[PDB]
Amino acid sequence: STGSATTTPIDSLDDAYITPVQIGTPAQTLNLDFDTGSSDLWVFSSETTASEVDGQTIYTPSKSTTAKLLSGATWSISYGDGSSSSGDVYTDTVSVGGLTVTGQAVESAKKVSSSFTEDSTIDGLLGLAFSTLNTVSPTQQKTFFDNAKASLDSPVFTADLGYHAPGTYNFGFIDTTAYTGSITYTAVSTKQGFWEWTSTGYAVGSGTFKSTSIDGIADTGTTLLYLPATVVSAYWAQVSGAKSSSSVGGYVFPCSATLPSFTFGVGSARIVIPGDYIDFGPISTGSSSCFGGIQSSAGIGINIFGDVALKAAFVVFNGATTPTLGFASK
Question: Where is the active site?
Answer without folding.
Answer: 35, 199
